[PDB]
Amino acid sequence: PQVAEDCMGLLQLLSNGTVLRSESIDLITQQFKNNQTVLFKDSIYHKPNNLHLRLYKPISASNRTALPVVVFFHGGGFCFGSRSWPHFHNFCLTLASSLNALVVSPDYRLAPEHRLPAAFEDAEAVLTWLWDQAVSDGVNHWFEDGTDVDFDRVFVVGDSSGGNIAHQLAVRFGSGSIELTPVRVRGYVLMGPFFGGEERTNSENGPSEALLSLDLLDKFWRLSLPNGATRDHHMANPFGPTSPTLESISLEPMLVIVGGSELLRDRAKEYAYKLKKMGGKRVDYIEFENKEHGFYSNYPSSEAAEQVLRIIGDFMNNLS
After folding, report:
1. Which InterPro entries match?
2. Using CA atoms, how far apart are residues 295 and 215, in angstroms rounded to an integer?
3. Residues β-bridged to residue 91
């Protein structure tokens, strides 16, 4: 059937997004009366793969002080998503304005065309691109304006599959493997992190969500993990028999945020508490009762979404 080549090409066109030619400004309503302007523009960070990221600058506080960096990795189960998608663009406008930080929102290669670890390799290229900009006075060319950026205050915020990406970066940075001074990642925020495993948890065997189901999560892993791999692969299960030696590596402080009704609740809770009992690991586990996957971005202007942005801000303030 040729209708199969088309549904494949549909996935590519669906998450291809667009690239802005010039810088643009949007209005974002803060926690409909209080507004805020956020400057943003697209830049290429990997020329061979034609991968772009979006930089966000809150205009009001950028001229007041040096901004910390928030690298945001969007979700999509390693198969969907783009930094230009309005759902993710709106969340980054909220991230920049509420956290008073420069937001870096990069695209990354998607499965099944680019199976894992293609997404993790792209994430490291993002941080390496950030390092290249930091040491070369490149922030001054980021906009038609000066930009003061505190590269000693970098934070990685990962949504769903981006939360998995954030964990892989935290491991690679904490193991002394990659090292990008003066870029210093002080903390990691894992928001409903897309972790997997062959054996099911109780919440994974529970009722389906508004969008997520256990069958959909299985199809995500199967289409994104390499051919012939199981859900116990280290790229899916952080505690699989491949790279579970997290006791040795020095992990940065972490924040795990999930909804109480999430299918991925038990995996993230087990992930956080296995880390809390490892020595030298500061991990805060926060569970929002009766919420499903992506409540912080699926329902903005709701109380739960605003509390998440506050918790991330407090988490950033304490770490610096």
Report:
1. AB_hydrolase_3, AB_hydrolase_fold, Carboxylest/Gibb_receptor
2. 20
3. none
Residue 15 is assigned to a ligand binding site: no
Using only C-alpha atoms, the chain has a radius of gyration, in whole angstroms, of: 19
Active site residue ranges: 160, 262, 293
Residue 283's CB: how many other CB atoms inside 10 A? 19
Domains assigned to the chain: 38-318 (3.40.50.1820)
Cis ω before 182 (30° cut-off from 0) = yes
The structure's method of determination equals X-ray
Please give the resolution of this entry in Å, rounded to 1 decimal.
Answer: 2.3
**240 in a known ligand binding site:** no
3-state secondary structure of 308: helix
Q: How many Å apart are CA 83 and CA 72, to the nearest integer?
A: 9
* Count of H-run helices and E-run strands, the chain: 9, 9
In angstroms, the CA 206 to CA 31 distance is: 34
138 annotated among ligand-binding-site residues: no
Question: Cβ of 317: how many Cβ atoms within 10 Å?
Answer: 10
Hey, is 314 helix, strand or coil?
Answer: helix
For 12, counting Cβ atoms within 10 Å of its Cβ (0-12 exposed, 13-18 middle, 19+ buried), the class is exposed
